[PDB]
Amino acid sequence: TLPYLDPAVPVADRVEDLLARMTLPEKVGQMLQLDARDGVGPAVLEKHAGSLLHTSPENVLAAHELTGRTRLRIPLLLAEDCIHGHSFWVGATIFPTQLGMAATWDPALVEQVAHATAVEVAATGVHWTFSPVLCIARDLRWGRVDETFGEDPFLIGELASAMVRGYQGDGLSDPTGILATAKHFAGYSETQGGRDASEADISQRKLRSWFLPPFERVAREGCATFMLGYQSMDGVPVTVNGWLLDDVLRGEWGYTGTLVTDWDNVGRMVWEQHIQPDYVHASAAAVRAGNDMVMTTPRFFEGALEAVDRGLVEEAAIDAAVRRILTLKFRLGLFEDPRRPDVARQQAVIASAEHAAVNLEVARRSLVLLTNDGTLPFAGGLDRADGRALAPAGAPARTIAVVGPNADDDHTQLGDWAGASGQADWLPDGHPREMTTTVLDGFRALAPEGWAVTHARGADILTLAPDQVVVPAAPDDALIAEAVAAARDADLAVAVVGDRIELVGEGRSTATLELVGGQVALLDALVATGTPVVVVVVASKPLVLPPSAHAAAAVVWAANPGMRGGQAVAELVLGLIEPEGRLPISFARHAGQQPTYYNVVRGQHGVRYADLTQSPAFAFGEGLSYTTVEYADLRVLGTEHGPDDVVRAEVTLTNTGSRPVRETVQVYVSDTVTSVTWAEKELKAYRKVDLAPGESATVGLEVPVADCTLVDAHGRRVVEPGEFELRVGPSSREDALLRASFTVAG
Amino acid sequence: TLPYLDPAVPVADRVEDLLARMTLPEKVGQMLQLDARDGVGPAVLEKHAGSLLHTSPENVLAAHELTGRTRLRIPLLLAEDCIHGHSFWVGATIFPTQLGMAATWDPALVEQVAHATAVEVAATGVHWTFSPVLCIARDLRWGRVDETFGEDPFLIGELASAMVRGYQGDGLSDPTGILATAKHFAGYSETQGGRDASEADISQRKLRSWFLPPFERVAREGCATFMLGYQSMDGVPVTVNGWLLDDVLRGEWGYTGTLVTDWDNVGRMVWEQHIQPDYVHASAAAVRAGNDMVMTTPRFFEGALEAVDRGLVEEAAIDAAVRRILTLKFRLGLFEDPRRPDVARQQAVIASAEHAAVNLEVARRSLVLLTNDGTLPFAGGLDRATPDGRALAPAGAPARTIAVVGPNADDDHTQLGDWAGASGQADWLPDGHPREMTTTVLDGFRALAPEGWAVTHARGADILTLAPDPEQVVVPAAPDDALIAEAVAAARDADLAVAVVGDRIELVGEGRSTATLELVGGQVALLDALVATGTPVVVVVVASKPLVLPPSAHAAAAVVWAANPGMRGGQAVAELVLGLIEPEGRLPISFARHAGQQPTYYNVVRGQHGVRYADLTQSPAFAFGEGLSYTTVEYADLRVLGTEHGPDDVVRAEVTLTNTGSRPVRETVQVYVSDTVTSVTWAEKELKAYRKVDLAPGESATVGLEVPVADCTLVDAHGRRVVEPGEFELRVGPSSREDALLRASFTVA
Ligand SMILES: OC[C@H]1O[C@@H](O)[C@H](O)[C@@H](O)[C@@H]1O
Ligand SMILES: OC[C@H]1O[C@@H](O)[C@H](O)[C@@H](O)[C@@H]1O
Ligand SMILES: [Ca+2]
Ligand SMILES: [Ca+2]
């Protein structure tokens, strides 16, 4: 012999050949992507699926052998959520969540993570990861903030671009490359009340301004697939949104990649949005809008059939989709080699030592030290003789009390979309305990031999009940008394607090942003012992911390740091490493304070709620080191530019302290007068700079003029001639930014 | 002639004769509305202003004398904020705020308030009120929620239409009529963060869905002027927003009234929104967009003169604006009668007996009883001997002590709310209105309590002080142990504790949004302590807007929402607590449990994955429409009388109500429409009609309901309001709570 089974015939012909031998039930199924957990058998055979997701290792094998038993035997596309590591492979390297990786501000490192993940993923016979996420964290209430790279469009585009580069490798012929997905196109992250897939009150211009830039960048860099979001946007769900799918994605951007809906997007139009009366119309509408893959809407099988029967859609539309789908499978060589799982390769690469080393580096670089009264690094800092630290001169016997509900919780440390977070029914126990170092484990392994590490759960967070729902745990006096006694008997109290899976993720938005359960009572009682308290926040997203946390000696943000996270936290507290992370997201002081992202649009009357500052608790870009860096002399080198030039500048940094630092210099551009209202400033560039104690460096900086854009009326992204301001410094706080003027002429 | 002074000459000819004699500075000046507080001399003489606002009484007489000294002697328009009464006339009738009056759900009553206000205003020489407010209260953080009629487009249209009818009376010839203003067109109440005039991230469809309907109503009913909002909307401030001004207001609606900007809109485009490099270009854009009156941007005078000289705008665009302004003045007859203030007329009508009686009725009907474990009406309820005097001690309660506590229990300024007296916007009333005209909660209990009862008072908490910014700043007061202990001691020696809690002016209004919605200062500690005494506590909320109440308030005996009830509000609360009146009010707005719970307005758009926040219910603390009486009312037989209707038809229906208790009630029956399946995502339900029913104890009544099919619309994609054929549910009950609502379906083919 047949022509579609001939690797000498071009793709287009083998497509048309194969299409000609397919029924209409087999063409409809070729768009289908079904849940493998409801039976691989009926999905490959009765329905004629083109793809499977959520496929356990046994079902992966079973699917390949059910393919030999179909009539034409089209190779399946096997897709999995490999969100920060091979999420659901029992012994895989699990990395920090995307939010924790964003704090490294290190795209070369994030490339390495995506590549490491791809090597592990390809070994298990999965071709397609639903990753990276390009949503922008603009409402902290949203449950899925942990899955974003934060609140800046530019940083998100940098890190997601690096993820796509790493996953896909060299192309459709790389053995260890996989298909990436630009995920939740577009606007899914800012919906009413921060709720999951409520209405997005987002106009075309608002979408173009803060949501589309990351997607457009990966779209022109070769991201293989895009995934359509759940949410209705200005009344119209993305699945049937011709403006976004056609005029933008296919039209303005010229994107030739493949589209997959989100889970039951077609069905939800019936029973949840109530914009379709039945599954035949719903199927029909999704066909007209230009969908390729329909994810987990089984009724789309008979729905799209009943709909071509009753003439609601022609057969020639189904063909257009099946054409782009089979084109992809043919371009991967899947009819030649279906990329079966190779057990020998699994044993060679999965959880390899060099993957663990990548994971440790991200962990170490992602921790953000937020406050520090000088208690850290503990006891002045430690050296090693890896290996155990030596006790410092004059600190022979110290006790570190590690307390709080997240101190030894390795499930919460891995976060959502990993292990037993719930989307895979084949890991009820999650990942092997030995692969994860909790905060407790980290101090126990690295403390000097004359030191002691004690442990006390000090608070619970919650229990489940029916009204199903989270019941916050009361403060529990015996539990707190025990943690207090441990702190009263120690030199340092390390309180590990945060959230956990029932307060994170899909359907689990939160309204208060506060520590649920006994944690606030715990923190109050720990701080009142007078033992210095380091608050380590292991949580999916930024939380409102209580006053006692701002009275504590130090605060470390760890954002679900993954499998080596506890090692990094212990190294940071002991001074075995220097802090390097910077916030990719602002921390609100109160849920009502929002919006707290740094790029707020000008215009407000006043600067202040009558009852509350508008200053965020912690701002985008901020983070401490163990030294002090002085910023001085920002000079724009030639202040006049045309629309294709580059703004070049210099700033001088001085390490005026006693320890080395890797500083992250941040470059913001402010457009002084704009035709339409615009952000007060936007991040456009950054540079990491290594500085030895006492070393001073003059640093070259650099922003393309073609990036100093806004979206005007009509909706064009243009550079507008006028005065500009360059703002350079260690964070987004205005009292930390040097500034210098420049101008763009026509 | 001169023909412009000839009332025999048709108006358009008089306009055109006067326009032709005007210099360019005189024409630009006619577009200025200047702040009379800054000096009435330069405004009228040097700047040739067409209008003044915030004009003190001595400045009103001065303004007329100055007009006689100008070249053209064009009579001024004197405009004022008369927002719930003549706000800034030292002894005028101050009614409840708009949020207070909305709880009455009574447009005929609201029309009488506006009429009474208009009679008082017109006696003082003011021609034009910047009222009513049509904004929709959709973010409770917003500082101006008290200026709205709540969160429902339909109720806002009803009451805003009543205000416009009352103010304007018989029209331009009516001596007690005044111009109304449809204020903050449009989208000003839902901006980022609930902040004052941040970005409104409002698309065209959303603006049409929830914000435009009440503006469209009063525009076709003849509202004389529209005020353009501060805020930038999808990048473009209303002031220069061609889609809103031309395509909608003057295109689709054919609106022919006069436009006025909000305060310094034009200049704000330079120094605040940063969309204009200088005032010349800001003035030019404002003229190009089609503005008429430019409020309090005095630099518009030079800027527009430079803009014409440099050729940025054509002089004929100025002429167009001056034509519309002059036409209004001619049609009002200001060139024949400029409507001088009248001292004899002031004495006749201001703070009159019949105006205080309208005030009393609004106040009584506005209180909302939200919770009640049976403690109310206190001691079983009282009677009067004398529909005015003290109540008599009832059977079984000869001696009772009432302890009136709380920061707002005796504070006349807070009870009147923003936009009244000493609220800040007028500088000639330093002590506000005369103390004796306002009955505080305390005053009311002291006047109504039977002879053998005693009324005590303890301030129990402070709310705030002011301080300089930790770079003018609200500093929440600490809980004060002595002051708490004094209110605790008063409560322990009492039968009932009436805790009057809320906010005050520094936590309310322009530039004064709130993030937490909680009671500020020592109020929470005071409530905790009071509830723990064992004496039953009635929590009375005198505040501008719905506050999140602490747990102790939900454990108290009863909770009463009063929303700044005006000068008689304390009489009303005392009467309510004593059972001298029945509760009638119903919430025009929902109460959130936490700022992070929003949105909590009843008409939320479908689509959410899940029902609740993982840490918190989405159920509001109190919902749109609810409110208790002192009796019980059953809703029984909801029946749609014929379920087939077409585009011109009327859905009719019956429901049966029974007063199964021992006490009379005026119940507010509420009618909601749900569009079961829509082409676009839409609200789960919307209020479309309501009706008040009187019921004596034991009485039943079958009640007829009608909703025009032409109101069961949605805004589709393409953005156009249409009834979509299909299935609908009719939901009828005493509130917007789904478990209080009978339902019946019907079809619109
Ligand atoms: O499992 C496949 C998909 O399930 C969905 O419900 C989530 O929104 C996506 O994040 C995910 O890729
Ligand atoms: O005072 C006149 C006007 O300017 C501003 O202070 C307010 O936004 C308006 O509501 C008011 O009508
Ligand atoms: Ca500019
Ligand atoms: Ca319908």
mmCIF file of C-alpha atoms in Angstrom, chain A residues 377-591:
data_model
loop_
_atom_site.group_PDB
_atom_site.id
_atom_site.type_symbol
_atom_site.label_atom_id
_atom_site.label_comp_id
_atom_site.label_asym_id
_atom_site.label_seq_id
_atom_site.Cartn_x
_atom_site.Cartn_y
_atom_site.Cartn_z
ATOM 1 C CA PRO A 377 23.268 32.050 57.429
ATOM 2 C CA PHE A 378 22.848 30.197 60.687
ATOM 3 C CA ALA A 379 25.728 30.531 63.179
ATOM 4 C CA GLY A 380 27.640 32.717 60.694
ATOM 5 C CA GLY A 381 27.713 30.082 57.976
ATOM 6 C CA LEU A 382 29.147 26.592 57.515
ATOM 7 C CA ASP A 383 31.689 24.893 55.257
ATOM 8 C CA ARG A 384 31.976 21.248 54.322
ATOM 9 C CA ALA A 385 35.005 19.164 55.165
ATOM 10 C CA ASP A 386 28.504 17.358 49.215
ATOM 11 C CA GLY A 387 29.095 15.681 52.591
ATOM 12 C CA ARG A 388 28.483 16.858 56.144
ATOM 13 C CA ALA A 389 29.130 20.401 57.316
ATOM 14 C CA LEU A 390 31.755 21.217 59.943
ATOM 15 C CA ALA A 391 30.610 22.904 63.144
ATOM 16 C CA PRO A 392 31.687 26.573 63.107
ATOM 17 C CA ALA A 393 34.180 27.941 65.599
ATOM 18 C CA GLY A 394 32.194 28.758 68.725
ATOM 19 C CA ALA A 395 29.048 26.800 67.719
ATOM 20 C CA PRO A 396 29.873 23.185 68.675
ATOM 21 C CA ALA A 397 26.414 21.984 69.756
ATOM 22 C CA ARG A 398 23.297 23.535 68.267
ATOM 23 C CA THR A 399 19.771 22.158 68.050
ATOM 24 C CA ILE A 400 17.584 22.945 65.029
ATOM 25 C CA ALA A 401 13.893 22.211 65.671
ATOM 26 C CA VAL A 402 12.177 21.535 62.317
ATOM 27 C CA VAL A 403 8.442 22.082 62.829
ATOM 28 C CA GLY A 404 5.220 22.622 60.917
ATOM 29 C CA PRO A 405 2.958 20.488 58.706
ATOM 30 C CA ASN A 406 5.116 20.712 55.576
ATOM 31 C CA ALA A 407 8.443 19.920 57.316
ATOM 32 C CA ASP A 408 8.422 16.234 56.362
ATOM 33 C CA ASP A 409 5.609 16.144 53.764
ATOM 34 C CA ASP A 410 7.090 14.922 50.512
ATOM 35 C CA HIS A 411 3.759 14.939 48.653
ATOM 36 C CA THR A 412 3.196 18.646 49.228
ATOM 37 C CA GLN A 413 6.836 19.273 48.357
ATOM 38 C CA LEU A 414 6.384 17.814 44.871
ATOM 39 C CA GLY A 415 3.187 19.773 44.377
ATOM 40 C CA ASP A 416 0.342 19.391 41.946
ATOM 41 C CA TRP A 417 0.707 17.438 38.692
ATOM 42 C CA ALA A 418 3.063 14.892 40.237
ATOM 43 C CA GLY A 419 2.818 11.497 41.882
ATOM 44 C CA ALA A 420 -0.432 11.160 43.832
ATOM 45 C CA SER A 421 -1.774 14.658 43.115
ATOM 46 C CA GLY A 422 -4.739 12.795 41.626
ATOM 47 C CA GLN A 423 -4.899 12.886 37.837
ATOM 48 C CA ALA A 424 -3.348 9.384 37.522
ATOM 49 C CA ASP A 425 -5.114 6.487 39.235
ATOM 50 C CA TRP A 426 -2.009 4.212 39.026
ATOM 51 C CA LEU A 427 0.159 6.030 41.670
ATOM 52 C CA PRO A 428 -1.993 5.996 44.885
ATOM 53 C CA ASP A 429 1.229 6.024 46.984
ATOM 54 C CA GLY A 430 3.010 8.525 44.746
ATOM 55 C CA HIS A 431 6.752 8.573 44.054
ATOM 56 C CA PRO A 432 9.305 6.517 46.097
ATOM 57 C CA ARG A 433 10.048 8.264 49.390
ATOM 58 C CA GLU A 434 13.817 7.833 49.074
ATOM 59 C CA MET A 435 13.911 10.022 45.966
ATOM 60 C CA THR A 436 12.694 13.094 47.909
ATOM 61 C CA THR A 437 14.623 15.042 50.527
ATOM 62 C CA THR A 438 12.179 16.909 52.728
ATOM 63 C CA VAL A 439 13.226 19.917 54.786
ATOM 64 C CA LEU A 440 13.537 17.620 57.814
ATOM 65 C CA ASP A 441 15.666 15.145 55.842
ATOM 66 C CA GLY A 442 17.876 17.989 54.604
ATOM 67 C CA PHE A 443 18.816 19.305 58.031
ATOM 68 C CA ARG A 444 19.285 15.759 59.370
ATOM 69 C CA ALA A 445 21.719 14.906 56.573
ATOM 70 C CA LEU A 446 23.726 18.163 56.597
ATOM 71 C CA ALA A 447 23.839 19.202 60.265
ATOM 72 C CA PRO A 448 27.341 18.841 61.757
ATOM 73 C CA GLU A 449 27.954 15.742 63.845
ATOM 74 C CA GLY A 450 27.794 17.548 67.184
ATOM 75 C CA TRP A 451 24.417 19.142 66.328
ATOM 76 C CA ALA A 452 20.915 17.804 66.824
ATOM 77 C CA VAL A 453 17.863 18.079 64.570
ATOM 78 C CA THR A 454 14.479 17.626 66.264
ATOM 79 C CA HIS A 455 11.038 17.377 64.688
ATOM 80 C CA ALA A 456 7.525 18.303 65.786
ATOM 81 C CA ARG A 457 4.438 18.536 63.650
ATOM 82 C CA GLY A 458 3.058 21.659 65.089
ATOM 83 C CA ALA A 459 -0.258 22.133 63.347
ATOM 84 C CA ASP A 460 -2.579 20.389 60.988
ATOM 85 C CA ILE A 461 -4.050 22.091 57.969
ATOM 86 C CA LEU A 462 -7.341 20.363 57.205
ATOM 87 C CA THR A 463 -9.623 17.387 57.014
ATOM 88 C CA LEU A 464 -12.218 16.382 54.417
ATOM 89 C CA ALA A 465 -15.961 16.130 55.109
ATOM 90 C CA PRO A 466 -19.254 16.115 53.172
ATOM 91 C CA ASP A 467 -21.613 19.120 53.130
ATOM 92 C CA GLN A 468 -15.980 16.573 49.813
ATOM 93 C CA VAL A 469 -15.166 19.993 51.330
ATOM 94 C CA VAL A 470 -12.141 21.259 53.235
ATOM 95 C CA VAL A 471 -12.699 21.573 56.973
ATOM 96 C CA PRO A 472 -9.774 23.623 58.331
ATOM 97 C CA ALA A 473 -8.179 22.000 61.361
ATOM 98 C CA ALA A 474 -8.583 23.867 64.629
ATOM 99 C CA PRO A 475 -5.516 24.980 66.587
ATOM 100 C CA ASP A 476 -4.624 21.973 68.722
ATOM 101 C CA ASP A 477 -3.051 22.935 72.042
ATOM 102 C CA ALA A 478 -1.178 19.687 72.636
ATOM 103 C CA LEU A 479 0.232 19.754 69.100
ATOM 104 C CA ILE A 480 1.357 23.376 69.625
ATOM 105 C CA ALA A 481 2.685 22.736 73.138
ATOM 106 C CA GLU A 482 4.908 19.995 71.699
ATOM 107 C CA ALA A 483 6.312 22.198 68.921
ATOM 108 C CA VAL A 484 6.802 25.029 71.436
ATOM 109 C CA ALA A 485 8.708 22.716 73.792
ATOM 110 C CA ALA A 486 10.915 21.689 70.846
ATOM 111 C CA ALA A 487 11.598 25.379 69.996
ATOM 112 C CA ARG A 488 12.226 26.242 73.683
ATOM 113 C CA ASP A 489 14.858 23.508 73.532
ATOM 114 C CA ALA A 490 16.578 24.654 70.347
ATOM 115 C CA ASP A 491 18.758 27.403 68.920
ATOM 116 C CA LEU A 492 16.757 27.736 65.700
ATOM 117 C CA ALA A 493 13.154 26.881 64.854
ATOM 118 C CA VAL A 494 12.514 26.129 61.189
ATOM 119 C CA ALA A 495 8.748 26.377 60.624
ATOM 120 C CA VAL A 496 7.704 24.805 57.299
ATOM 121 C CA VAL A 497 4.229 26.113 56.400
ATOM 122 C CA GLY A 498 2.109 26.513 53.305
ATOM 123 C CA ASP A 499 -0.759 24.715 51.610
ATOM 124 C CA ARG A 500 -1.455 21.222 50.276
ATOM 125 C CA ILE A 501 -3.208 19.499 47.410
ATOM 126 C CA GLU A 502 -6.851 19.953 48.546
ATOM 127 C CA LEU A 503 -6.218 23.735 48.465
ATOM 128 C CA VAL A 504 -4.468 23.729 45.070
ATOM 129 C CA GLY A 505 -5.304 23.206 41.427
ATOM 130 C CA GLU A 506 -8.323 22.605 39.223
ATOM 131 C CA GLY A 507 -11.579 23.447 40.932
ATOM 132 C CA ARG A 508 -9.592 24.540 44.006
ATOM 133 C CA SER A 509 -9.300 28.306 43.884
ATOM 134 C CA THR A 510 -8.912 29.971 47.290
ATOM 135 C CA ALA A 511 -10.502 33.205 48.487
ATOM 136 C CA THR A 512 -8.424 34.266 51.502
ATOM 137 C CA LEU A 513 -4.846 33.386 50.423
ATOM 138 C CA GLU A 514 -4.056 32.724 54.118
ATOM 139 C CA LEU A 515 -2.487 29.758 55.929
ATOM 140 C CA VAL A 516 -5.342 27.308 56.519
ATOM 141 C CA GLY A 517 -5.734 25.422 59.802
ATOM 142 C CA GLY A 518 -3.516 25.558 62.874
ATOM 143 C CA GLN A 519 -0.519 27.130 61.144
ATOM 144 C CA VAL A 520 -1.180 30.732 62.200
ATOM 145 C CA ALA A 521 -1.573 29.692 65.844
ATOM 146 C CA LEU A 522 1.627 27.629 65.499
ATOM 147 C CA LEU A 523 3.624 30.547 64.050
ATOM 148 C CA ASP A 524 2.405 32.930 66.777
ATOM 149 C CA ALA A 525 3.438 30.515 69.537
ATOM 150 C CA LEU A 526 6.831 29.676 67.980
ATOM 151 C CA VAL A 527 7.810 33.331 67.598
ATOM 152 C CA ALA A 528 6.784 34.054 71.201
ATOM 153 C CA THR A 529 9.332 31.512 72.533
ATOM 154 C CA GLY A 530 12.199 33.870 71.625
ATOM 155 C CA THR A 531 13.989 31.142 69.716
ATOM 156 C CA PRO A 532 14.759 32.660 66.270
ATOM 157 C CA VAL A 533 12.268 31.357 63.714
ATOM 158 C CA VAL A 534 12.923 30.763 60.035
ATOM 159 C CA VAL A 535 9.620 30.505 58.164
ATOM 160 C CA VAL A 536 10.007 28.263 55.110
ATOM 161 C CA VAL A 537 6.943 28.586 52.880
ATOM 162 C CA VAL A 538 6.354 25.377 50.927
ATOM 163 C CA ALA A 539 3.217 26.221 49.017
ATOM 164 C CA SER A 540 1.705 26.204 45.564
ATOM 165 C CA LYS A 541 1.314 29.991 45.322
ATOM 166 C CA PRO A 542 2.031 33.211 47.256
ATOM 167 C CA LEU A 543 0.091 33.374 50.517
ATOM 168 C CA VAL A 544 -0.824 36.121 52.948
ATOM 169 C CA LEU A 545 1.426 35.525 55.920
ATOM 170 C CA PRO A 546 0.320 36.491 59.449
ATOM 171 C CA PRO A 547 2.012 39.281 61.449
ATOM 172 C CA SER A 548 4.039 36.697 63.415
ATOM 173 C CA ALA A 549 5.744 35.672 60.151
ATOM 174 C CA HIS A 550 6.894 39.279 59.643
ATOM 175 C CA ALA A 551 8.215 39.265 63.228
ATOM 176 C CA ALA A 552 10.192 36.076 62.556
ATOM 177 C CA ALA A 553 13.936 36.082 61.949
ATOM 178 C CA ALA A 554 13.776 35.065 58.295
ATOM 179 C CA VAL A 555 11.289 34.050 55.592
ATOM 180 C CA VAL A 556 12.185 31.710 52.712
ATOM 181 C CA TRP A 557 9.855 31.115 49.763
ATOM 182 C CA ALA A 558 10.288 27.639 48.228
ATOM 183 C CA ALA A 559 7.136 27.215 45.994
ATOM 184 C CA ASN A 560 6.989 23.400 45.908
ATOM 185 C CA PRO A 561 10.728 22.903 45.280
ATOM 186 C CA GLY A 562 10.529 19.309 44.088
ATOM 187 C CA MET A 563 12.568 16.247 44.950
ATOM 188 C CA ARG A 564 15.844 17.934 46.057
ATOM 189 C CA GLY A 565 14.024 20.883 47.638
ATOM 190 C CA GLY A 566 14.773 19.980 51.245
ATOM 191 C CA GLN A 567 18.465 19.684 50.452
ATOM 192 C CA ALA A 568 18.464 23.202 48.978
ATOM 193 C CA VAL A 569 16.552 24.674 51.939
ATOM 194 C CA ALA A 570 18.966 23.182 54.461
ATOM 195 C CA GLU A 571 22.009 24.315 52.442
ATOM 196 C CA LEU A 572 20.586 27.834 52.293
ATOM 197 C CA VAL A 573 19.843 28.091 56.020
ATOM 198 C CA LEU A 574 23.317 26.765 56.903
ATOM 199 C CA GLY A 575 25.147 28.936 54.371
ATOM 200 C CA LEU A 576 26.391 26.036 52.255
ATOM 201 C CA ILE A 577 24.966 27.935 49.268
ATOM 202 C CA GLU A 578 24.108 31.571 48.596
ATOM 203 C CA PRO A 579 20.500 32.622 47.883
ATOM 204 C CA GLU A 580 19.915 33.462 44.243
ATOM 205 C CA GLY A 581 16.191 33.298 43.534
ATOM 206 C CA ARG A 582 14.157 36.378 42.744
ATOM 207 C CA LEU A 583 10.359 36.511 42.823
ATOM 208 C CA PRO A 584 8.601 35.942 39.470
ATOM 209 C CA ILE A 585 5.330 36.998 41.148
ATOM 210 C CA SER A 586 4.202 39.565 43.736
ATOM 211 C CA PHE A 587 2.812 38.620 47.196
ATOM 212 C CA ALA A 588 -0.407 40.348 48.262
ATOM 213 C CA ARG A 589 -0.926 41.597 51.804
ATOM 214 C CA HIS A 590 -4.616 40.675 51.576
ATOM 215 C CA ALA A 591 -6.859 39.188 48.901
#
